[PDB]
Structure 1
Amino acid sequence: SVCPSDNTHATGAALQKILDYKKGDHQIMAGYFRSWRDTASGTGNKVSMLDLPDCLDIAFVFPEGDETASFWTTLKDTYVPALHGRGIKVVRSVGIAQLINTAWDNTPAGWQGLADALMKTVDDYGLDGLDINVQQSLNANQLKQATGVFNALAKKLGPKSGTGKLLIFDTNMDGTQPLWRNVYPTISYVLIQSYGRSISGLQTTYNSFKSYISSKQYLIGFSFYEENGTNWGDTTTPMTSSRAWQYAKWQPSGATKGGIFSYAIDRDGVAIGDNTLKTTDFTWTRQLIGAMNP
């Protein structure tokens, strides 16, 4: 209720009230910003990470791996400080593929070396932590390497580090995945990719994790419509009937969830089927923040 009804960017009094909101108890909002859709990357893009709503908790930098040096420069020099001004945390996402890369020794030294290399994606940009995207099962050697890397990262990020920086586990699999069973003690938040998913399933998936976390570490994710993308149908009209809305309102039985996240937050409000790039006032984000913290 200290959050703008449009996407205004507070400056003084209006700002401090948003900072103090974020310092206190709330269901948090996170969003994956597709780096290749930032105005500072290539051309033709309409949305910039500077547009992101003041009442957002975490912004994920999600590169595809071809983004121009302009974007990274902009991120370091411009976007991170501005987003830090609004009390918005900025977190680099990387695929689990990076943590099981066989170019890196499957040894203690190898795990540290790989962690150090991944920590440069955080430190070199003044980021608030690292998000590992886990969407695949692992063999015994891949598991051993990924676990080692998590344990090394845990010295600088997440609940074991004492730095206040985040180590985030984002996945479309459940809490029986061996990697989760090995690294759950290192994890700040666990974000469940729940695009197109039955509301009837949310408790079942949550139950798989609940013994390893508090409810406040758990987030569920819906997708915005990606240009030429999968039709998850998470953002159908009317809004207050959408899967996204149902996610904001959903609570595990007996407890309160940590919040929700959007994939492709740069596509906030673009209709399902509209494959053009457009600007956004982040209506859906700000509305869903309000629907969680009334």
Structure 2
Amino acid sequence: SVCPSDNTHATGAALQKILDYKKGDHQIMAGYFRSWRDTASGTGNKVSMLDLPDCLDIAFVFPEGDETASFWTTLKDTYVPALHGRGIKVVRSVGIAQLINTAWDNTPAGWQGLADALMKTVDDYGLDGLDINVQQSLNANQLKQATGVFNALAKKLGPKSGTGKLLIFDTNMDGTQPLWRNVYPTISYVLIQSYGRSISGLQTTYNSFKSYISSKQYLIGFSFYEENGTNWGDTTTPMTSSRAWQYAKWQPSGATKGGIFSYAIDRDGVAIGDNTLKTTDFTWTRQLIGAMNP
């Protein structure tokens, strides 16, 4: 409610009140910003991480690996400081593929070596921590390696570390996945990719995790419309009948959730089926913060 009705970037006491709102109890908003769509990567992009709304809690840096070096330069030198100025946490996202890479030894030394290499992706940018994207089951060997790496990371990130840095588990699977059963003690937040899902199915999914967390750790995810992407239908008009909107309102029975996140926050407000790149004032993000914290 100390948040702007447009997308101003407040400067003094207007900003301080937003800095205090964020230290206060609230349902948090998170956004995956696709790095290859940042104006500092390639050409033809319309949106910068500098445009992210002041009332955002976490920005994920989600690369695909063909971003131009200019992106990483701007992230370290410009973007991270300005987002930290707005009290926005910046977190690097990486796929589970990275933690089960067989180029790294499946041994204590190997789990530590790999954790060191992922920790460079955090420390070299002054980031607030690391997000691991899990969308697959693992064999015994993969499970063993991923668990080892989570356990090595847990020394520097998340609840076991005492650093204040985040260790995030984001997934489209449930709390029965063996990796989850191995690593839940290491986790800051768990984010459920819930694109195009039943409002009626939400409780069932939460219940699969609720024994391993408090409800403030749990966030649910909708997607914005990706240019040439899957039509999940999470952002239909009118807004206040959207799946995203109903996600902002949903609470598990007898408890309050952590909040929600968007995939492709860089696509906030682009109509479903509009495959061109546009700018955004982050209307949906800002509305959806209001919807969770009225």
- TM-score (normalizing by structure 2): 1.00
Match of 1:234?
234
SS at match of 2:284: helix
C-alpha distance in 1 between matches for 2:17 and 2:146: 41
The list of structure 1 runs, each at least 4 consecutive aligned residues, that deviate by more than 2 angstroms after superposition, is: none
CA deviation profile, 1:41-69 (whole Å, cap 9, x unmatched): 00000000000000000000000110010
CA deviation profile, 1:190-231 (whole Å, cap 9, x unmatched): 000000000000000000000000000000000000000000
Identity of aligned residues (%): 100
Shift of 1:236: 0.1
C-alpha distance in 1 between matches for 2:129 and 2:163: 10
Shift of 1:13: 0.7
Matched, 1:291 2:283: no
CA deviation profile, 1:144-163 (whole Å, cap 9, x unmatched): 00000000000000000000
SS at match of 2:209: helix
CA deviation profile, 1:128-170 (whole Å, cap 9, x unmatched): 0000000000000000000000000000000000000000000
CA deviation profile, 1:72-120 (whole Å, cap 9, x unmatched): 0000000000000000000000000000000000000000000000000
For the aligned residues, what is the CA RMSD?
0.2
C-alpha distance in 2 between matches for 1:202 and 1:278: 32
Shift of 1:286: 0.3
Matched, 1:44 2:44: yes
Aligned length: 294
Correspondence 1:140-219 to 2 at 5 A: 140-219=140-219
CA deviation profile, 1:238-275 (whole Å, cap 9, x unmatched): 00000000000000000000000000000000000000
Match of 1:77?
77
C-alpha distance in 2 between matches for 1:45 and 1:13: 33
Shift of 1:20: 0.2
SS at match of 1:191: strand
Shift of 1:185: 0.1
SS at match of 1:211: helix
- TM-score (normalizing by structure 1): 1.00
Match of 1:53?
53
C-alpha distance in 2 between matches for 1:149 and 1:286: 36
Match of 1:29?
29
Shift of 1:126: 0.1
SS at match of 1:92: strand
C-alpha distance in 2 between matches for 1:73 and 1:111: 28
C-alpha distance in 1 between matches for 2:13 and 2:84: 17
C-alpha distance in 2 between matches for 1:222 and 1:176: 22
Which sections of structure 2, spanning at least 5 residues, go unmatched?
none
SS at match of 2:227: coil
C-alpha distance in 2 between matches for 1:10 and 1:122: 28
CA deviation profile, 1:6-36 (whole Å, cap 9, x unmatched): 0000100100000000001000000000000
SS at match of 1:222: strand
C-alpha distance in 1 between matches for 2:276 and 2:27: 32
